[PDB]
């Protein structure tokens, strides 16, 4: 009974491997020989945001390219103004540990989550004049690792008990749930058209989940260790992942396999965040050896390096207009890099 | 541009209020020390939390000793896979690790699992500045189990027969020297693990505890005192 299902599983995986080798007509790194290189990208630090006590764990730029949410481990959730470096709101948290924060595309809500198993959605309207807990979500059994806003009334969350969830913020209940993984699901990233999203876990797999349908469609297994970050290419037809085997990988949603691998022999440290640029030609990658490498995303060469931090880079965010790039590390500082 | 100056004034007043709030919360956050309470579920850390007092994922205990505040964070309804959330715990002032010594002649060799887990914690890259305090539980139970007729520990550890009681570690009166040999054997296991790396950045503190006992809090206070003093001596390039 088990043998006739495991042999059929191995046959279907051989069929998938043979369709991927059949569709492998060439590589991206051959047809990009005659492309002008992007030269040494020399970015400068313009700002340095202070005022945190414990290590900064995650950040998220707003859609206006103006405000950014930063989340620390002392229990503070600060809303920053990137231009003037003025703190606009500072929120004290009931629990200390936060692993995710998310700034709504309308600017009305801010979500945060961590070890408490509870996603706290805060309202920034505040007709009284004080920030207050709008609604707290509790339906997980693991740890809450990432969350993202589709819009004002729906939120996708990523847990540590092998499940993802889609909530309704009005009712407070889970609209649906996504059970395909077999390990800790570390982060997720939303498509621009907010219909699909990709999820990276600790079994070296990335799943493509359909929000409206409710089941997964593709599984990409190109890595060797735990996948920490994931992020879409701006057009929504490709996406880059960062694992702990020190390699970045660039995958495709129609070729149904990987397109390129980014690796350098002097680098043996983990990846903790990636993010594309606005055009997609640069890929920023936050490594564990205290610097952020600027890869040329069509030549697989290092265009540059951002060696500003004094401790492990934990989060990395690029604005929607590509005007600046913010990095947050465990030394409690936010560097705002901006190339000149 | 007068309105723009009004808005700048507004944002500077906001910034000053928020910086006052942060300066008032920085004292509170640097005063209170932080403990991570990690133990197997068979080991009675529930007894330790109930003594400490006298659906959510993480559990929290706030107390004070000699007007010094201590938060003790219990890991509750979490997953068995510990390798990702343990990286969030590199800023606590200590990790207290509680293991139960079972030696009745038992689904698995829980002591070997405990040794492997302690080794994983000790050699982890981001736990190389966090000290570990160590509680060996069920010592009264280990006294009760010498009269089983046979020995579990010698079966599971072939070095127990070729082991001598340390001359320099005095036993309490009224204890069976077999049981004391057991205790010191397990303590030497954990000290060999802790001494193998020999980094000296972080240390391991073995202590004993009974099923019902009250000195535990004083032990944890004194060992946090030792960890802070050794960290200050580390900062002055003296150790």
């Amino acid at each position, epitope marked *: 009974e088990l043998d006739q299902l495991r042999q059929e599983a191995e046959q279907l995986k051989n069929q998938i491997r043979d369709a991927r080798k059949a569709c492998a007509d060439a590589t991206l790194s051959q047809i990009t020989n005659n492309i002008d290189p992007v030269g040494r990208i020399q970015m400068r630090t313009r700002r340095t945001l202070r005022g945190h006590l414990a290590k900064i764990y995650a950040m998220h730029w707003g859609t206006d390219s103006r405000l950014l949410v930063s989340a620390s481990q002392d229990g503070k959730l600060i809303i920053w103004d990137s231009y003037t470096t003025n703190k606009v709101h500072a929120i004290p948290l009931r629990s200390s540990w936060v692993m995710t924060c998310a700034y709504a595309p309308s600017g009305n809500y801010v979500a945060c989550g961590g070890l408490d198993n509870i996603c706290s959605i805060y309202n920034l309207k505040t007709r009284e004049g004080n920030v207050r807990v709008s609604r707290e979500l509790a339906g997980h059994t693991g740890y809450l690792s990432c969350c993202r806003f589709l819009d004002d009334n729906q939120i996708v969350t990523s847990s540590g008990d*092998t499940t993802c969830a889609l909530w309704d913020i009005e009712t407070g209940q889970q609209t649906t749930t996504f059970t395909g993984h*077999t*390990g800790d699901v570390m982060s997720l990233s939303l498509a621009p058209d907010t219909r699909l999203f990709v999820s990276g876990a*600790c*079994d*070296a797999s990335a799943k493509l989940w359909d929000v409206r349908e409710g089941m997964c469609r593709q599984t990409f*297994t*190109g890595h*060797e*260790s*735990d996948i920490n970050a994931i992020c879409f290419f701006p057009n929504g037809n490709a996406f880059a992942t960062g694992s*702990d*085997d*020190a390699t970045c990988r660039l995958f495709d949603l129609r070729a149904d396999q990987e397109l390129m691998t980014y690796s350098h022999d002097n680098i*043996i440290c*983990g990846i903790t965040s990636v993010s594309f640029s606005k055009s997609g030609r640069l890929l920023l990658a936050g490594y564990d050896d205290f610097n952020c490498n600027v890869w040329d995303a069509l030549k697989a060469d290092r265009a540059g390096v951002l060696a500003g931090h004094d401790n492990r880079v934990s989060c990395l965010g690029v604005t929607d207009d590509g005007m600046a790039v913010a990095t947050g590390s465990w030394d409690s500082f936010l560097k705002i890099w901006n190339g000149s | 541009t007068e309105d723009q100056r009004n808005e700048e004034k507004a944002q500077r007043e906001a910034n000053k209020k928020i910086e006052k709030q942060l300066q008032k919360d920085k004292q509170v956050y640097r005063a209170t020390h932080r403990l991570l309470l990690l133990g197997a579920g068979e080991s009675g850390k529930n007894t330790i939390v109930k003594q400490m007092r006298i659906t959510s994922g993480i559990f929290e205990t706030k107390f004070q000793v000699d007007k010094v505040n201590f938060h003790m964070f219990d890991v509750g309804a979490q*997953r*068995d*896979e*510990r*390798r990702k959330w343990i990286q969030c715990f590199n800023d606590v002032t200590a990790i207290i690790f509680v293991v139960a010594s079972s030696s009745y002649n038992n*689904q*698995t*060799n829980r002591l*070997q*699992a405990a040794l*492997k*887990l302690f*080794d*994983s*914690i*000790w*050699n*982890n*890259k981001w736990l190389r500045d966090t000290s570990v305090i160590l509680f060996l539980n069920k010592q009264d139970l280990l006294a009760e189990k010498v009269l089983a007729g046979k020995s579990k520990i010698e*079966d*599971y*550890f*072939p*070095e127990f027969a070729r082991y001598t009681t340390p001359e320099d570690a005095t036993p309490e009166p009224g204890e069976d020297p077999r049981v004391t040999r057991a205790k010191y054997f397990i303590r030497d296991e954990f000290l060999r693990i802790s001494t193998a790396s020999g980094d000296g950045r972080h240390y391991c503190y073995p202590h004993f505890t009974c099923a019902v006992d009250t000195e535990n809090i004083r032990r944890v206070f004194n060992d946090c005192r030792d960890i802070i003093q050794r960290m200050h001596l580390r900062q002055y390039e003296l150790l």
Partner: nanobody
Amino acid sequence: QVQLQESGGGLVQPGGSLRLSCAASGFTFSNYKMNWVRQAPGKGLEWVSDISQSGASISYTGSVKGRFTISRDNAKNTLYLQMNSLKPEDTAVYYCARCPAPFTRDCFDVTSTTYAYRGQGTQVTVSS
């Protein structure tokens, strides 16, 4: 794709000998510390033995120490476990497990809740 294929096993008699194999396909084999873990019928998972990257540092579980020989072949990409002087208490399912990060010394691989980085395992039974 990380895949681990155990090989060998079967019904044996006590005092005998048996060699097990672990075919490690789909990763850079020479950089990962590996280990062997066993599951007794109706009991929990327990660690058996391990082996580092180069092969220098080796350790075993106490109760089978000096009875088992663990050896990695980086050339042929294969982990070998030699088991002589067998005991009736050693019947179990065997699991060839890998530590999750490369270039490290710690492992977290005793987890029964669907740990991804071990093989399907092989049955070894001692019948008198």
